[PDB]
A paper describes a structure:
The Rab11 subfamily plays important roles in specific trafficking events such as exocytosis, endosomal recycling, and cytokinesis. SH3BP5 and SH3BP5-like (SH3BP5L) proteins have recently been found to serve as guanine nucleotide exchange factors (GEF) for Rab11. SH3BP5 exhibits a V-shaped structure comprising two coiled coils. The coiled coil composed of α1, and α4 is solely responsible for the Rab11a binding and GEF activity.
Because computational secondary structure prediction assigned the N- and C-terminal regions as mostly disordered regions, we selected the central helical region for crystallography. We found that the R260A/R261A/R262A triple mutation reduced the degradation and obtained diffraction-quality crystals. This construct of SH3BP5 (41–266; R260A/R261A/R262A) is hereafter referred to as SH3BP5-RA. The asymmetric units of the I41 and P41 crystals contain one and two SH3BP5 molecules, respectively. Therefore, we obtained five different apo-SH3BP5 structures in total (i.e., one from I41 SeMet SH3BP5-RA/M167A, two from P41 SeMet SH3BP5-RA/M167A, and two from P41 native SH3BP5-RA).
Author numbering: 41 to 263
Write the structure that this text describes.
Amino acid sequence: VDPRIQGELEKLNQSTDDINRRETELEDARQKFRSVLVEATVKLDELVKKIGKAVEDSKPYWEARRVARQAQLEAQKATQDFQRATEVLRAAKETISLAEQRLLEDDKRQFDSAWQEMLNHATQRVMEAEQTKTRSELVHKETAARYNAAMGRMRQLEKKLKRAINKSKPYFELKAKYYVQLEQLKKTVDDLQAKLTLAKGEYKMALKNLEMISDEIHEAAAS
């Protein structure tokens, strides 16, 4: 079948054009990343020569400042898992206390039967709550000191070698301005790269049809 093959032919040649285009789109994306990279580093290395020793002496603090953020997020879990534990205890205390008012009387006729299932659950609820409470109230304590020690150490390392930290300030800033630029560029290249392989992938997929179509037209030929 001649009409069967010519249609498939047009498709593969359109793919090769699209791929050839997208390859060149990456080339401009690749070399521009190469260019920005080397351009970035001649600036940062120049800063090193300006102020070298201070930056080295500054790194004990910045690593400690990193720990400051990490020690904090330990507390963020501790305080909130404790806040939840206190609320669960209160809501269960409420469920019990409201039941307790109707529990002293036992005079409720139609109400007492309804109440007791609620009470028995709540009394079994507090069994679980107080334990997660005591666990969380201690976790609240563990992270807290580390958070105080981290600040205390940061503060101690703040007050010590301030001079070192002052001179290193511009270095980490151009480091940060380039860092956020590169992270954005990598994603542009990486996502284009993925889009390449899907195109080169669907191109290989289109050729497999030809093998099958040649195989398929072969059966018709035998007749």
